Design a binder for this molecule. Sequence first.
Ligand code: D10
Lengths: 79, 78
Amino acid sequence: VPPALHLVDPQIQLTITRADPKVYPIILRLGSNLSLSMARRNLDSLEARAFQSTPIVVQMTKLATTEELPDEFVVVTAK
Amino acid sequence: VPPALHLVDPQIQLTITADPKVYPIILRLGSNLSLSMARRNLDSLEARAFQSTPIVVQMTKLATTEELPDEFVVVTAK
Ligand SMILES: CCCCCCCCCC
């Protein structure tokens, strides 16, 4: 079965740069599933994790019709 | 068998809403991911509904954890 296309909400989008523009929503060709987390330096202790990992909630949407998409967007071929 | 940390350059970064910011990307790639830019084919009808142009990721492999930003997002690539 071909890895149905998933729309990652505008909440989260990519930013490619030159000049300054370019913010494309995200599409997933998820074969294997991807995990996303937020990390931050541990600058107030030295027995605590070097970095603080806070898993991130991806509210991506599964799609049925290609008409729901925008003219340009990035596609994470989950390869 | 791995995974090593890979820093995806500034060129490419994730983003969040309104005044909000961007975070560089780190990969715990299990599988080596592919990325591509797509576009609707609004001037034709015989060539792909969308323009898939594979995208070049200039990510860097990290040796030290000291090279990392204070904040950032990690894509644990299962
Ligand atoms: C689970 C959401 C993963 C989205 C991050 C995609 C980063 C680009 C890898 C090429």
